[PDB]
Specification:
The structure is cut from a larger assembly and holds 1 copy of chain A, 2 copies of chain B, 1 copy of chain C, 1 copy of chain D, 1 copy of chain E and 1 copy of chain F. Chain A is an alpha+beta fold. Chain A contains 16 helices and 17 strands. In chain D, 43% of the residues lie in helices and 8% in strands. The radius of gyration of chain D is 19 Å and the shape is elongated. Classes of the chains: A alpha+beta, B mainly alpha, C alpha+beta, D mainly alpha, E mainly alpha, F alpha+beta. It is classed as chaperone.
Chain lengths: 513, 178, 65, 72, 73, 508, 118
């Protein structure tokens, strides 16, 4: 019928019309967006990557573009706008092939040979690095940050990132860097210059009673439970309906807790992390004061992520009651440190602890909260660049030059395919070049001149040379010294491949019942 | 309004929304044109329905105004930056930039690299500052034909109380030294 | 807000407001006084030789009034 | 010939702030050059006639803002 | 199917250049040009190259697309 | 209050089938494309659906004639497997043909008989092509490897298909006379690999050993019971009432810790550390059971004793009133294995018989859900090979074998019914049309050519649409059971004829 | 006035595309003495008459020259050739005004990905 053909055409056309204005990235290009919602919220945006993270779309093919940026951030963390504009280039090609009269099924496995040759040719132009060498890990992460916002924070946050990975990674052949290993904390107090990389686990726990155990005399405890006490987890033997009756259960409550807090002081375990399983704000506010009198670093209803790292890093497992004399599945600590920069900030450092071979932690400080946030996103992107090299060690050019450099070569390999897919991939191999032109296209007057000029100079440049990405003009971008990892691009190859293939798998749109 | 209204955020996607904000910025700039300089015209501006004020200070005007466009918005933001510096020179930055954001989209479009028009703006800015340091042709007040008295007398002639300012010239010379 | 009105139309609008006020009060002036009659919006007659009692009770226009 | 048409003009003015000999654009060599050294030749009088004629028609039409018609 | 048809001799160009082996239109399943004997004059095909690019050149010849109401009327 | 006339009710019966038959015909065959379910009526979600049951049930049909089609395709998928997909298309393909009969104004009773005797004509031609390949043991080994390659296909799997193939073929051949449909258990959990599926030597219960409990129990003597607790244990003849104000709400929540100690006194008298119970525990009871010396093993079920009943020789029992009414358990070693992301206790010992336990590894819930039904389809069909070792040529090669012979019987046998018998056979050849576009091949060159070709010789030659070509259905291993193709015909033939007898829809 | 001129003279020396970046910038300077002249009822046309008549091509030097001048008094809106007046603002208030007026046109450009939100 006409209905499956028209929806697949419209499923392409809707998300592509979304993706048309997404070609506005790479720096100062265009006009600002004060966005008003259907509810009326003022949304003043300038950063297109967060725009893709916040992107509210009702069209479901355009809703895959949300996950496309989510998958790009979790795999590479780099070029979240880049995976979309090449997927918009995918939506360019699929229209006319249907207008030619090609099956959408054939265009689905057309995407395989584009992916298979694409990861092959980018491998041929890339050069690997050595993942025990401090220099080669340093040259690429800063060069990416030089294309990013910070340039003076790139000098300090990058060698902190290089020493961060070498704690987490093994010698050269290894794939072990997770975002669920390194916690990026926030500390009011200190500054960006006062930031510190701590070898071990540093948890962001709010710890009352600064002036606490600051020494190596420490063990750490992750408790899934709370201390059993009258009117905490035991019971009172009288009834309370009076203010005079209320005082009698308060006295027997805090009396037994004083017997509880000394036995944890007897243990040497100075840290207690309490889960979110409340009874009366699970462990009593009378109980936290007597733990603080025993100088024990405690918090209640802590987040789930803090529980996950302390079980992961040292190996801390839940134990029995301290009246039941805990089964020593608690972690062995060699530092419990409460941190105070300018008298502010509540932070726990555990230095020299056991590790499974990974999990370094950072202390990101800042004079304001905004001063925290500037270095927080900056070192986090500095982690993701080397993380691509850990998962795949190779060097390609940065700035989208291998996107067109693949395109100059792939069309030759498109001729060698000689299939029906030869015409499909070549139709997309010509669609990949658009990234300097169409990013420039959405600005002002005199429109016809610049567009194809920004793509001739690479084809004139060669399969080996093209236009520069930081000053423009034909030069070797490696001689311009602009680098990025291969996993920045080849993940953007595969993630865009499956989604637009899945658009070909769409027919006869439905809604649940 | 031009451009589609079916989409949200007042998005018109292209030359219409680039033609929208050149109208939104110039109308802000046109307010300062009436109130420009010491000869600039005073505007009676109603605050809610009955409260009014009479101003020709552009920064005071922009405190009254509530922006509904980014072209309305960023002109209020950049002018308040000069306002916390001195409060003077805030009038000049508003009027010029309305023509500038007509000229910038036409050429940053035309990239070999998009910041070259912006660096051309900054090179024009740095070309000014060099010749700004080369200026002694007009405006010396550190001396005159006699002294700072010659600066202050013409300054007290610029502020009219009649033909006077002759005895008042010596006050301004003493004030940085008293 | 965002609002701009072009020059001549406002200064002429200042003329139309002020002169119509200046019409009857010129004839309310002196021993040759007329009376400015305000009909109440809820019904009722008010006429004096003072337009300030007349104007401050009635809807005052914005531009020059 | 295929150019950023305005950016060519910007290039030709620098060669008139530095040289100023014959600098123009080529459509048949497809670049910028000295067109006398690119041998693009034509006698100068017809240009002088064109400069007078373009000035004559332009000042005349602007001198008429008042036009009288007769539909009878 | 013409979509299948452009595929086959394209693989033959990977096989062999300057083909005397192109498609058939007699549905014999024997795609040749020398055993299918579909052969024409080289001058005639070359003339077809000149004539087709002539027309695209011809419609490009002035920049005038204005009318007084009468340019096709 | 609405009596709908036959002329719309017949038309509703056809548009009820066409609007659902096109949904899954992408996913039929080797499925060059899929169906992508879009969630907007319930939530904001996106589903990739090759499962027809996800297509039929999650999109509730509002055509009452289509409601019959969803229901009869449901029971076919439940018993045999892959039944929502095949039955619904073939019923929808018949009803496109029946419109031309009503366009020619054919008696509807002729259409009822015309597909019916042709269905009898097809199954005999389907029976003639049914050939044993599970005859000898090396044949019966290689019989089930190729069929599990076909049945696990037409679904979305990354690397799962070959490892779910060779695992289940080992499970069928060990019994030698019945299939394993009695006490094998499909365990799905979070794993790190998208390829792993291994058979258990023993059986496992969900028990993450925690606070102070030992990891290995040796010389097991299992006390099997159904009495348990979650957080509540009141006294036998007494009670505790603590409410008279708003401060008692906090103290009535603190009394649940002292309720956990009374149940521990019951198990402590037994002296049996191997006590399983159907009810779960938390971090709060677990500190009390292991401190007494009697370990509480939670998340138990009937399935564990039933798996212990067949191999060891015991019985499955329940209703724990006195311990001689529940059949107890005996094991050699109790060890905790770590499978995927999850830690489970595992009662390891004698195994490998009428009872196993299949554990699945995958971090994605969507990958685990499709792998369940794909394995659920084959284990019945591999048991149907034990019932009938007659296999038949999958991929539509057996489809043309029936369309070859029914068309011949559509000519000779009837005298008026030939127009109704042919609409059967033309709809049979619509099944290679919906798959030829999926591989990209011309449907018109497919459906008539190979039907005459393999029938006149080399029936093994069939539809290899993993290449878009003609291939051999016993050399490339593309063959399925005679039983699965036999059952999907009768459900597809009946449901179309049921709503064809509908000539008055009335909506009260 | 000289910044409107001798930056465009500087713009031609740069050559290519960046010339009209300077030139449109220096063109936009002209409206400031013009609109103040209309507020002073001097109306912008003798203002562009005198200031271009001052600026010497053979003497592009300002020093104190009797061959080019750049001054203008604003309280009348007519150029009174003065250098002791209180209408001539120093370097410090002007160089920062050149920053934010340049930055405001840059400020609108800083978008990536113009979108909508439901």
């Amino acid at each position: 019928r006409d209905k499956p053909a028209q929806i697949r055409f419209s499923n392409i056309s809707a998300a592509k019309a979304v993706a048309d204005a997404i070609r506005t990235s790479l720096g100062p290009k265009g006009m600002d967006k004060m966005i008003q919602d259907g509810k009326g919220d003022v949304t003043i945006t300038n950063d297109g990557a967060t725009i893709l993270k916040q992107m509210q779309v009702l069209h479901p093919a355009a809703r895959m573009l949300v996950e496309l940026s989510k998958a790009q951030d979790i795999e590479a963390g780099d070029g979240t706008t880049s995976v979309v504009i090449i997927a918009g280039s995918l939506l360019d090609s699929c229209t006319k092939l249907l207008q030619k009269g090609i099956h959408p099924t054939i265009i689905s496995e057309s995407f395989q040979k584009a992916l298979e040759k694409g990861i092959e040719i980018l491998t041929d132009m890339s050069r690997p690095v050595e993942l025990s060498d401090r220099e080669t890990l340093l040259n690429s992460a800063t060069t990416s940050l030089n294309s990013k916002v910070v340039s003076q924070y790139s000098s300090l946050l990058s060698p902190m990132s290089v020493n961060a990975v070498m704690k987490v990674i093994d010698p050269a052949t290894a794939t072990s860097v997770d975002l669920r290993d390194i916690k990026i904390v926030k500390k009011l107090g200190g500054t960006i210059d006062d930031c510190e990389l701590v070898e071990g686990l540093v948890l962001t726990q709010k710890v009352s009673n600064s002036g606490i155990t600051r020494v190596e005399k420490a063990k750490i405890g992750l408790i899934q439970f709370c201390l059993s006490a009258p009117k905490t987890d035991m019971d009172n033997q009288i009834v309370v309906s009076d203010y005079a009756q209320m005082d009698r259960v308060l006295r027997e409550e805090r009396a037994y807790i004083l017997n509880l807090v000394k036995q944890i002081k007897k243990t040497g375990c100075n840290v207690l992390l309490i889960q979110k399983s409340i009874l009366r704000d699970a462990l009593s506010d009378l109980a936290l004061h007597f733990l603080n009198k025993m100088k024990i670093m405690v918090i209640k209803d802590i987040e789930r992520e803090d529980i996950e790292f302390i079980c992961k890093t040292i190996g801390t497992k839940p134990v029995a009651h301290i009246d039941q004399f805990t089964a020593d599945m608690l972690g062995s600590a060699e530092l419990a440190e409460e941190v105070n920069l300018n008298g502010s900030g509540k932070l726990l450092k555990i230095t020299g602890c056991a590790s499974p071979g990974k999990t370094v932690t950072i202390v990101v400080r800042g004079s304001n909260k905004l001063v925290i946030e500037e270095a927080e996103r900056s070192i986090h992107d500095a982690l993701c660049v080397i993380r691509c090299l850990v998962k795949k060690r190779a060097l390609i050019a940065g700035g989208g030059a291998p996107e067109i450099e693949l395109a100059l070569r792939l069309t030759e390999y498109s001729r060698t395919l000689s299939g029906m897919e030869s015409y499909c991939v070549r139709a997309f191999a010509d669609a990949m070049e658009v990234i300097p032109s169409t990013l420039a296209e959405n600005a002002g007057l005199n429109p016809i001149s610049t567009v194809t000029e920004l793509r001739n100079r690479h084809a004139q440049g060669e399969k080996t040379a093209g236009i520069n990405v930081r000053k423009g003009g034909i030069s070797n971008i490696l001689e311009e010294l602009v680098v990025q990892p291969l996993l920045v691009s080849v993940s953007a190859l595969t993630l865009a491949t499956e989604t637009v293939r899945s658009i070909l798998k769409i027919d006869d749109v439905v809604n649940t019942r | 309004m031009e451009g589609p209204l079916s989409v949200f955020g007042d998005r018109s996607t292209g030359e219409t929304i680039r033609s929208q904000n050149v109208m939104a910025a110039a109308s802000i700039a046109n307010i300062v044109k009436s109130s420009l300089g010491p000869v600039g015209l005073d505007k009676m501006l109603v605050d809610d329905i009955g409260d009014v004020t009479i101003t020709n200070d552009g920064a005071t005007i922009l405190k009254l105004l509530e922006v509904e466009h980014p072209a309305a918005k960023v002109l209020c933001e950049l002018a308040d930056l000069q306002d916390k510096e001195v409060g003077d020179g805030t009038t000049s930055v508003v009027i010029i930039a309305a023509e500038l954001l007509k000229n910038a989209d036409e050429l940053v479009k035309q990239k070999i690299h998009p910041t070259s028009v912006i660096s051309g703006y900054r090179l024009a800015c740095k070309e000014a500052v060099r010749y700004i340091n080369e200026n002694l042709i007009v405006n010396t007040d550190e001396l005159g034909r006699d002294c700072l008295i010659n600066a202050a007398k013409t300054s007290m002639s610029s502020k009219i109380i009649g033909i006077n300012g002759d005895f008042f010239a010596n006050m301004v010379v003493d004030a940085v030294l008293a | 807000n965002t609002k701009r009105e072009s020059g001549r139309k406002v200064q002429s609008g200042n003329i139309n407001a002020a002169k119509t006020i200046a019409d009857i009060i010129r004839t309310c002036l002196g021993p040759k006084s007329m009376m400015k009659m305000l009909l109440d919006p809820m019904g009722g007659i008010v006429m004096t030789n003072d337009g300030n009692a007349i104007l401050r009770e009635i809807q005052v226009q914005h531009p020059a009034a | 010939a295929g150019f950023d048409a305005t950016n060519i003009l910007n290039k030709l003015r620098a060669r008139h702030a530095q040289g100023g000999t014959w600098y123009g654009v080529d459509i048949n060599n497809e670049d910028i050059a000295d067109n006398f050294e690119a041998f693009v030749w034509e006698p100068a009088m017809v240009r002088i006639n064109a400069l007078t004629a373009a000035s004559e028609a332009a000042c005349l039409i602007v001198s008429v803002d008042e036009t009288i018609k007769n539909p009878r | 199917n013409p979509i299948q048809t452009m595929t086959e001799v394209r693989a033959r160009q990977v096989k062999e250049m300057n083909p005397a082996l192109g498609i058939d239109c007699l549905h014999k399943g024997t795609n040749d040009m020398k055993q299918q004997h579909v052969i024409e004059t080289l001058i005639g095909k070359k003339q077809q190259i000149s004539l087709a690019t002539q027309m695209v050149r011809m419609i490009l010849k002035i920049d005038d697309i204005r009318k007084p109401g009468e340019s096709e009327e | 209050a609405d009596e709908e006339r036959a002329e719309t009710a017949r038309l509703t019966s056809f548009i009820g089938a066409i609007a659902i038959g096109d949904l899954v015909k992408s996913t039929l065959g080797p499925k060059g494309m899929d169906k992508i379910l879009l969630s907007s009526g319930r939530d904001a979600s996106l589903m990739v659906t090759n499962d027809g049951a996800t297509i039929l049930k999650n999109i509730g049909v509002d055509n009452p004639a289509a409601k019959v089609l969803v229901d009869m395709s449901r029971v076919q998928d439940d018993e045999v497997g892959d039944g929502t997909t095949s039955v619904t298309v073939l019923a929808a393909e018949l009803l496109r043909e029946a419109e031309s009969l009503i366009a020619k104004k054919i008696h509807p009773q002729t259409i009822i008989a015309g597909w019916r005797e042709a269905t009898k004509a097809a199954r005999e031609a389907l029976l003639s092509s049914a050939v044993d390949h599970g005859s000898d043991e090396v044949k019966f080994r290689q019989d089930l490897m190729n069929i599990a390659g076909t049945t696990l296909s037409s679904k979305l799997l990354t690397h799962h298909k070959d490892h779910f193939t060779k695992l289940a073929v080992e499970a069928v051949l060990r019994l030698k006379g019945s299939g394993n449909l009695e006490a094998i258990h499909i365990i799905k959990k979070l794993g790190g690999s998208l390829a792993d599926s291994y058979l258990d030597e023993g059986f496992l219960l969900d028990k993450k050993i925690g606070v102070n409990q030992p990891k290995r129990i040796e010389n097991a003597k299992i006390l099997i019971a159904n009495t348990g607790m979650d957080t509540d244990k009141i006294k036998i003849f007494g009670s505790r009432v603590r409410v008279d104000s708003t401060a008692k709400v906090a103290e009535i929540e603190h009394a649940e810790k002292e309720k956990m100690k009374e149940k521990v006194e019951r198990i402590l008298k037994h002296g049996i550390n191997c006590f399983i119970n159907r009810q779960l525990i938390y971090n709060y009871p677990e500190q009390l059971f292991g401190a007494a010396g009697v370990m509480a093993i939670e998340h138990a079920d009937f399935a564990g004793v039933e798996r212990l009943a067949l191999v060891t020789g015991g019985e499955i029992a329940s209703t724990f009133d006195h311990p001689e009414l529940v059949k107890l358990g005996s094991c050699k070693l109790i060890e905790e294995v770590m499978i995927g992301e999850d830690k489970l206790i595992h009662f390891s010992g004698v195994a490998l018989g009428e009872a196993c336990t299949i554990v699945l590894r995958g971090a994605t819930q969507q990958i685990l859900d499709e792998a369940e039904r794909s394995l659920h389809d084959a284990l019945c069909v591999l048991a149907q090979t034990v019932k009938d070792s007659r296999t038949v040529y999958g991929g539509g090669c057996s489809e043309m074998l029936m369309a070859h012979a029914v068309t011949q019987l559509a000519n000779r046998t009837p005298g008026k019914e030939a127009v109704a018998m042919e609409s059967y056979a033309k709809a049979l050849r619509m099944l290679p049309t919906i798959i030829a576009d999926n591989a990209g091949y011309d449907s018109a060159d497919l459906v008539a050519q190979l039907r005459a070709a393999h029938s006149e010789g080399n029936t093994t030659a069939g539809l290899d649409m993993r290449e878009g070509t003609i291939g051999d259905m016993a050399i490339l291993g593309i063959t399925e059971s005679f039983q699965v193709k036999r059952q999907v015909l009768l459900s597809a033939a009946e449901a179309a004829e049921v709503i064809l007898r509908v000539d008055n829809i009335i909506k009260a | 006035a000289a910044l409107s001129i001798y930056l465009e003279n500087y713009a031609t020396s740069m050559g290519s595309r960046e010339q009209l970046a300077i030139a449109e910038f220096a063109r936009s300077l002209l409206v400031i003495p013009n609109t103040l002249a209309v507020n002073a009822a001097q109306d912008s046309t003798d203002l562009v008459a005198k200031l271009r008549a001052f600026h010497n091509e053979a003497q592009v030097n300002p020093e104190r020259k009797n061959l080019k001048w750049i001054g203008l008094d604003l309280s009348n809106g007519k150029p009174r050739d003065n250098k002791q007046a209180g209408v001539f603002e120093p370097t410090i208030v002007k160089v920062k005004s050149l920053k934010f007026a340049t930055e405001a046109a840059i400020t609108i450009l800083r978008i990536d990905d113009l979108i909508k939100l439901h």
